[PDB]
Design a binder for this molecule. Sequence first.
Ligand SMILES: [Mg+2]
Ligand SMILES: [Zn+2]
Lengths: 119, 489, 51, 497, 447, 99, 199
Amino acid sequence: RQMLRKATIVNAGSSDFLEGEQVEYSRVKIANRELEANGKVGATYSRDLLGITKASLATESFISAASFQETTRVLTEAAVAGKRDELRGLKENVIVGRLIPAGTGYAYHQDRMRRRAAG
Amino acid sequence: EEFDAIKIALASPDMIRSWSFGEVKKPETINYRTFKPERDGLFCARIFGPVKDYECLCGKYKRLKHRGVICEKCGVEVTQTKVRRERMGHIELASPTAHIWFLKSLPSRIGLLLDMPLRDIERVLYFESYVVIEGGMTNLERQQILTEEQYLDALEEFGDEFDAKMGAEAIQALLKSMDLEQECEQLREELNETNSETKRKKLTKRIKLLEAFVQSGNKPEWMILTVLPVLPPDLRPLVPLDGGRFATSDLNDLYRRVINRNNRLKRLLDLAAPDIIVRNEKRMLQEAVDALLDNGRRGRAITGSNKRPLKSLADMIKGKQGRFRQNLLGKRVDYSGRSVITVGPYLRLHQCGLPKKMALELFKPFIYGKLELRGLATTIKAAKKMVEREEAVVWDILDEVIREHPVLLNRAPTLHRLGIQAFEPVLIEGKAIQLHPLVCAAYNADFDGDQMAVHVPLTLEAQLEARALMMSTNNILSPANGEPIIVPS
Amino acid sequence: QDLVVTEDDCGTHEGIMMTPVIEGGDVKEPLRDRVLGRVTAEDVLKPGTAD
Amino acid sequence: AAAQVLSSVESEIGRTTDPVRMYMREMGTVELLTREGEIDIAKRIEDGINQVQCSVAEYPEAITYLLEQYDRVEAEEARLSDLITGFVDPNAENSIDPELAREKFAELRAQYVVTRDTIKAKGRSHATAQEEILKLSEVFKQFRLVPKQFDYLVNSMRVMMDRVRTQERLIMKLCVEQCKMPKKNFITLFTGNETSDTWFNAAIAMNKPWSEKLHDVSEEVHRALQKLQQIEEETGLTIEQVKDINRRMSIGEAKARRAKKEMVEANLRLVISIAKKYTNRGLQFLDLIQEGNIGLMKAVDKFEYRRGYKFSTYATWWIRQAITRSIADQARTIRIPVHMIETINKLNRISRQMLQEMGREPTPEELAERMLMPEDKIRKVLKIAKEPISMETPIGDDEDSHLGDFIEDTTLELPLDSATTESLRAATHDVLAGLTAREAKVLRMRFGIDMNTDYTLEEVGKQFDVTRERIRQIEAKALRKLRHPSRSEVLRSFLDD
Amino acid sequence: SAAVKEFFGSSQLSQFMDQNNPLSEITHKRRISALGPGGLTRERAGFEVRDVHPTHYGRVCPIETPEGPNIGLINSLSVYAQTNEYGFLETPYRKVTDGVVTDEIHYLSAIEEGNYVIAQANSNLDEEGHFVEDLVTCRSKGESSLFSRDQVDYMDVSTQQVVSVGASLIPFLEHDDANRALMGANMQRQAVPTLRADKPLVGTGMERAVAVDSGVTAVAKRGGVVQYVDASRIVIKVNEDEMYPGEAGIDIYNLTKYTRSNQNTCINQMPCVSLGEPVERGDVLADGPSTDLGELALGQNMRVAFMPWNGYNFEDSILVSERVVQEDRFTTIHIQELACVSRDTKLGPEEITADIPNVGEAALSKLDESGIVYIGAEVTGGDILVGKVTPKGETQLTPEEKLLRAIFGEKASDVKDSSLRVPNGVSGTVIDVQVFTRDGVEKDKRA
Amino acid sequence: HARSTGSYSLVTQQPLGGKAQFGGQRFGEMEVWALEAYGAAYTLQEMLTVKSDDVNGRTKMYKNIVDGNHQMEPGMPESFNVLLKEIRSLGINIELEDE
Amino acid sequence: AAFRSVFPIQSYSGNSELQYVSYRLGEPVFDVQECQIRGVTYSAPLRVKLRLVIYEREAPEGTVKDIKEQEVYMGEIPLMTDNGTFVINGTERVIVSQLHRSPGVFFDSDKGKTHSSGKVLYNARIIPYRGSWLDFEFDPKDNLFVRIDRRRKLPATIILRALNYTTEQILDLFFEKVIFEIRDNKLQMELVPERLRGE
DNA sequence: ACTTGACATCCACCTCACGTATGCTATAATGTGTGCAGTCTGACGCGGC
DNA sequence: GCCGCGTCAGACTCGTAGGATTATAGCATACGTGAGGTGGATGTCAAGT
RNA sequence: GAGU
Ligand SMILES: [Mg+2]
Ligand SMILES: [Zn+2]
């Protein structure tokens, strides 16, 4: 399932997809739920394939990815796009010395979610 | 503290100016006799903070009574030394230099943005050949290679309007003047006509980059660096070994060579030197900066006095023994011990033999606290010396702490989660740890010279999670197979 | 790493058919061995005097 | 023709990063003229500087400034250095006799007055007056200012030129960007009249409906003109005899500039050869060549063709010195001044001898004998001697630890020792409570504990009320209470402290 | 001299020898590594070189080598093999001249060895002549099988010629799998001699040659009759046969007593023979540490019962009698060498004195006037051996401590206690202390 | 080898290695993983912070342990601070987004 | 070996020379135990009888100018102990014997390797004791490439060009000559019997 | 309880001494250093024939 | 898509050994810094108030 | 080297 993390877009909404977009599987369903409730244009997808290294490089955590390998390549990728990391991931929190967001800490980290909704 | 997210982006020169608190002009480090920092030097206290807490260079202003006051003579503000762990400085390079990373490492986004292949750009920077920047005269367009005398025939007849140059400066110029906004639009209109599949693929990826570029709000000009941010001193430390020798980080050396060349550049500027030498100086400048960030990733690797290439910034981060693997996704641990394991047939399933002396050391702070509470120790200093004498009271207090406490037993390699387990420790004299036989399979351990580490779950939550989840007794069914883990051997 | 139990039931109906791997002569892993402890999708039948 | 081979080797440059090759190829284009060719360019240099000196002498204010600056220092009784040491140092194609200076200034003032009288009658330079102005210029050409004083002089004419052009550029901003009009016409009007008001109203004669507005800020307009016209007044220079001096001075400069460029370019290979002598595993190969180049510049500018010596011999020295001063100056983490350096050098040279005749090593005493220096000086030089080892140095023969992995930090105290410090502060505060109100206040103040400030005895006295040494007996009294073994049993545990 | 000291000191080929036992020493010197300058690195090594070549037969011991990363790289030279002038390894073989086995020994290189047909060492021979078997067991062209007498050119000199030093001591090697054989030879190198060295009762005949060659024992050059024996020196009067008439015939053997090895292990040489006894050339006079009357005495032999115990002998765990302690078998002497340096910073010359601020006089007691331990005192963890004092730097004491200091007025002078303390968890008797006087400033009273 | 607390490394401020200099044992990537397998957040955090490069954390937690508290009182690993500023010296913008 | 390789070392001008006569080893200055104790390396002094010999510019090769003959000091050389060990900085090390691939010529095969073909790509590797190395390896297309100092591949033929050999001499020393005479209107060859075997 | 004078011991700021910075020299001298790295290998990626 | 040329990888803890390489010149003037000196501030003392 |  982690290897199915990202997919290939055929056709957009009013957002910036188009042929051969390389977006996350979850973001796809995002767009779906949102826009198909209003109508407009829902995007078509097909899931694509990431094996190990690929999948790792795909993830929405550059800290996690940089912790893996190809640190050089990785980091400039990140730097260029101005990528933002919200600390969903585990090794993320590891490296920040924070509350791992599984079990024991999962509770605390989900609490921060509603803290983002209100102040 | 309380923050939520991190954004990683390009370094604006004025952003470096923002963090950077002073300019490092001198290659000097510290004075040869008075080992205190040199004025505008690499370890300068005027910039990065005072050597010793709330005490400046020349020593007129002492004590906590001064906090943020600025030493009139020596220019040292009075506060914690610890600021040398965070204050960043800056180097003003007269020749803006290329950022290595965006050149030499793939894909090399500069190249991508300007659709320029590598060697052509190279020759431009290295000052092998000139490049076309912007001409009212359609004589030439953008981004053409011209050698020496190819440049000569053109100006001689033209000039005036005709604008092209050489090197990094030229690149940065081309970058500021290029209309990213318009190009995005034009590329959509190119898609508006022939959308041939292969062409459309690469056209797709290029527009992706440009659009993300002004979404982040980043200026390409930043690609080339004018101001270089310079690392805090404590991170590039210089101290003496006991034998009288000094050791210092290699970054200091790279930085040194950098300002040498940069400052010779300033001299050669003022003296109006020939262009041959200017260029040579800039290549070297380029070189020095680039070996600073990533050594070996450019030309021939800069060598240590040894034989080995010198370890730069990137090396520190990336390496397996870099910051990630050494300091971040694992660290060195307190309240821990280790030694040889030995069978304990008498042990119950939830028990481990723990050598007196080992547990002693671990529980030190606990002992001290309980000493003072019992009043058997007037204060903590006496508590320490009370344990270090080794009297009988020490064993009983330790005995009460060990009661209901778990300790953590590590064994490498970490196969699965039971390679580290929580056990109730059973004190014995002797220096061997004793292990329950049935859990041999979980550690994949056997008795013929294996050593186990030990740690202290320190908080109430530590203790709790160890007894609840981490107990050998609590986890007998394999997360791997459904079957029992702890089984007769 | 991030794959964690966030909701307890999303309510999807879809899922995969697992067989007994009787590869060649021997039944190296049967149904129960492969299937045990798994959450099931779908109603399993087999017609009879009553179904 | 040399421009040919550069291109073919540039065409096969398989990306050649090694800057040595690049540099070698570029220098490899330019060839070497020896002997008198060098002297050719040297003479052109002389002429450029001479031209520029001629221009200085032609200007009223330069000579005015000369005399007034001398008078400033000279009026202060009889100053020796400072301003006087800056001036003078004259080359007559250093102790300057009083009698000569008295006389040399005399004919200058006289010349001043005569050359003013001539200018006024008829023209600025009608025939005979042109002869006399050129005669006065030949007067000034005969002395040779040392570069020091000359340079402040060049800048003031330079500066005033910049003022003119800069004021025009300020006006050019608002005029060029905000308005707009064909450039062609301007030439004639500005060149012709300059001083009078005729072009003012004559400009209006061409008509055109866009000329009426301009009155609303008419006051500001011509009043702003004032600044630039005042430039004219202060300088006091005539329209015809202003451009000529500037243009021609620029000529003198360019001649000299490009001349020395040629000289420099020509001597590359000599620099390189001398530089490669001390490549040998000390400093960086290319580094050497860089500061060698700066030594060559020195050689250019100080070389006098008059001396009649071969160029290579003299240049050798300046490049040599630049290299050695740079090596000693830069190189090391710890900079080492000269005397230090030289002594180190002596040491090692003698070391070889000594080792070879003793059979083994020179003990500090024995070495110190041959040096004629004190043993402890030699011992302490040996100590200071050894240079820093890298922090990243693989100390493990197996790239196991990089020195840093051994490193202990003396600054951080242990949590155990923190408890030490903290516990005694707590105990001290509680013990303070036991003292009587004003006594407690006294001791609190004096030591600054629990107070921002640590007041000394006298300061306590001022705040308290007069008392001096009374508080010294307060010290002793508090000391009595606290010397009390009963009260200080915990404090007695810190006896071992 | 710089290049030379770099070869000896800094080269990977110049390494700390294992001196735990004579075996480790002996073996370690004749180990051969494919690594170092002009040779393969660890990453440089694939399957290629790590795997076993059949031609290793009689030249390198196939079962001596470190496991994990070093395996395949470093091997032991097998017994009888030696180098020609060009540095190719040759192995000695017995000539067989058309059917008949001579006493002629021929040393052959590898490529030469491939050519000729060699009979096995175990093959059966007839009384100083021909072979027992019509079809004999032979090797040639790297291959192994059955061959006739007529083609047979040579034969193995002895069985033990396959293997190196460590492996040769293992008596029942034929019955042990190589996994464990390997480790066996390795382990032997790590065995520490006890003070009470015992000869191997289960041996190989090998044990005499090993010990003698190691040179950790004392051996007779000429022999003769032993005139005077001391636990320090042994003097021997040589027989008139070997004795030269011009010089004197009194032979000198200075004995190394209780000396410390690199690995902390003890090397003590004790005299074996009796005063007035006759011995000849190459007899073993004094035993080295792990040596018996000429024999390698690496360890000790005990009564072992194979059998399960109540989980005490679990997974190769080991159960023993109190009697082992009682008899002091497997007690070993270890010498640790520890230093203290007196240097001079610009902060102040450090001095060696007995002067120590704020310590119990109990600890001070073991020190003399110069600050030196009395030789032969028994010391414990925490106890100080050697007094050293150092100029303390500037410390701004909190007003608290000024107050404190004023109160008791204790003579606290800017001095840090530099004196060299004894190890935690290690104790015992000091044997010998040494002084290193610099020339300029004169020696301390203890010096 | 017994170690509660003792000498730290200069740059990362982590304990050094081995009983040689009274160093702490390393809790490595693998070791981390053990913890992560379980749901133990604060154990983790002890390893990561109070027991390693968190100066504030280990000192004040020591105090609290002696007094009879046993809490964490959390902070920030100085290793990470190290890392941030090292990214910044590379000319790359790295920072804490205020929540 | 080293001395005669370096010596006699003649001056650039061809006039002065330093000649090697014979050497001598000083008996070790400080004993073993002392070296252990004081942290020094156990070493003996080396001296060498050199003769400074001056030829004349003027006289043709009149070895008849000056001869100064004396023993110059070349430093201290680490000695080996009786047991085969060394004393370096106060401690015992041993220099372990070293295996390595001998200088000379190796002809290796690329078994399979690269390609889907599994093209049998043979190559000759030349390793001298002192100097740069030569590599001659086969292209998949059967072409013979050289790598000087194993850097990059080019044609082996061009090496022979550098060696002063023209195209014809090359083709001679490798391939098999065959003489073909033109007479009247028919073609005759000088034929070797063994040439048409198996055709 | 609190002041006064006399004396000792201490803390701040200025004046002189030693260290540091750069320039000058004159038979003539002008293209060269230096590498040791390496070979394991299936991969994924960019470019090109 | 086929060779090919280039890059980036190749576990976890702990135990134990010691440090370097070089070949160089010298000086005279000037200008500023660090160290120690000298007087003031502040402590210490013995009566004296 | 030790061990897993
Ligand atoms: Mg076993
Ligand atoms: Zn100050």
